[PDB]
Amino acid sequence: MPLNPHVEALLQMMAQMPAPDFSVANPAEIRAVFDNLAAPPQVARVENIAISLDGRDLDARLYVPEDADERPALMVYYHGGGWVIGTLDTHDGTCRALAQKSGCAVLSIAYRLAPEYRYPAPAEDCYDALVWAKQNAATLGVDGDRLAVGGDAAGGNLAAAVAIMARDRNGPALRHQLLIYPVTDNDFTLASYAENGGGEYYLSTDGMRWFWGHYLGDTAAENAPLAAVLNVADLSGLAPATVITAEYDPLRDEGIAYAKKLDAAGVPVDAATAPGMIHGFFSMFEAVPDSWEWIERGASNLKRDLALE
Amino acid sequence: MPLNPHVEALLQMMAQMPAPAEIRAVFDNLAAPPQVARVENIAISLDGRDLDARLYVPEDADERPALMVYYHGGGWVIGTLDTHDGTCRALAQKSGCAVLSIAYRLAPEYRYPAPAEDCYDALVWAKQNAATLGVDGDRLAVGGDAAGGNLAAAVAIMARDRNGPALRHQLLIYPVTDNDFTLASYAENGGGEYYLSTDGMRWFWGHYLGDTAAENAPLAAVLNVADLSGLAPATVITAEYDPLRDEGIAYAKKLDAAGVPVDAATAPGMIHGFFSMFEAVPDSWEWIERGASNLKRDLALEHHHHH
Ligand SMILES: O=C(N[C@H](CO)[C@H](O)c1ccc([N+](=O)[O-])cc1)C(Cl)Cl
């Protein structure tokens, strides 16, 4: 029986990886190379946390990075997955990566998912969770005065909405919003949807129709102000943003767009499209070494806006 | 910029894989660590030393589940709770049993027999502290991959010889059982193009034994133990393109010959370490499932009427 084709593709992929050319095979070197290969990014502590809110319990996970401060700043993170899928486990690597590179604690929220809980519910979970974290800051062991929200894809959509909710509802003061290739609108005619939406690049335009439909259900996009945050008339007074888009992401244009509108309304923004990258690439750092550059970039903005002043 | 070549290689890797509640069931389980209900970082205080441990309790385990005590691989020199986290989650999930992953002390800092005595002592702790762990101390099993399967095999032998915890199973995943590098699979598979090399194994063995000759290390080269009878029923899963294939098979044959019930097979087309590769190689799941299924059978819950 010949080599399993997938094992072959794995071996090829391991072979095209950045050499760690330690000059000699001693136990410390071999250990570092195997840990780099086979373990998720190291953090000091990971705590499975139950968040009891009015009406509902949400699972969450606290990541505390090695060499963080006594009481580090916190970013409350919202996984992506089109408001329909995604778990704490699918984004465990991404949260660890961000925590490691920012030196910030990261609290990842398992908000309730559509269609079971259609739009207003998931964003209310995410907002109520940021509130919970603020009010239980000392109990988590973090500084609730240095708060951020972040998220990828649908999660970036939720983080933008929470930032809006926190400004409108006069909630937790946020030092940053980290938006990683975020969903911002349901206009599927955009250039990048034609260019990138065929399914060739993981995420497809039809996927996004499917997601949006499950999230909104019977609500009209126009009657869903925290869904298409791109359509929010006024984006002034929002937390400083980082908006990283990907070149071959169907969401690229609308994400780029939102960043422009934030910059228009006065919000400080670092905004970049990652060359050669697809949707979901923050989560692909194990196979795509170049993902780390952009992870480091976003975390570097967080580390700056969350500094103990 | 052109599409990133690592990204493009990843994309064709996904494309190379065949095929709301059902949709989540699939996509949540690709490129992600398998979900379990509870994961607890545990410290084990033994005589002379404290070991790190991690307890995995899967979804839909019994009120007081069976326990497999698991020993990671890494040639007795490398590996952590973190490097084998994914593997432990997969086995807990597919078996329905709790899994206790043990961070035994590593060679060359701690040479044979130290890592083995850690692994045995951790089993005895787990049985003694079953109420503390919330598991059923009468439904115990050991397991491990590579040098971890070696340690599991050695522990099953020690538990037998020392009137130690009764074991219902030993799951041995492409185990190291001997340092005979003359064997066929080393010549065929031990070149280095298949992850593990004969040279790698020499290195590991050198670090593990130190000055001690193999002939004086029966709990290391378990293939040189005379009487394997009365040992825990075994699963021994080897890999076609693994240098360790042949000594794994040999150990299985000797288990069987001694009257130990053994499920033994060679995963066709697979390399050393493929149980840990299930995110990239979904066909690994077939073998994970078989191994975990044998665990589940031998760690069977007792009868309870439901009326
Ligand atoms: O023993 C070794 N690796 C073993 C292979 O069994 C280890 O079990 C392992 C390999 C790969 C892996 N992964 O890619 O997640 C995890 C563990 C050495 Cl050759 Cl580095």
Numbering used by the authors:
A (entry chain B): 1 to 270, 270A, 270B, 271 to 307
B (entry chain A): 1 to 19, 27 to 314
Task: Please give me the paper's original passages concerning this structure.
EstDL136 exhibits two different activities for the catalytic metabolism of chloramphenicol (Cm), a widely used, broad-spectrum antibiotic; it acts as both a Cm acetate esterase (CAE) and a Cm hydrolase. EstDL136 cleaves the amide linkage at C2 of Cm and thereby confers Cm resistance to bacteria heterologously expressing the EstDL136 gene.
In the dimer, each monomer adopts a conformation essentially identical to that observed in EstDL136(ΔPMP), with a root-mean-square-deviation of 0.91 Å for 300 Cα atoms. Therefore, in addition to deletion of the potential hinge region in EstDL136(ΔPMP/S156A), it could be possible that extensive intersubunit interactions affect conformational mobility of the CAP region. Specifically, the p-nitro group of Cm is located near the entrance to the active site pocket, and its C2 group points toward Ala156 located at the bottom of the pocket, a mutated residue for the catalytic residue Ser156. In particular, the CAP domain of the adjacent monomer interacts with bound Cm. Residues within 5.0 Å of the Cm-binding site include Phe34*, Ile88, His94, Asp155, Tyr205, Leu206, Phe214, and Ser286.
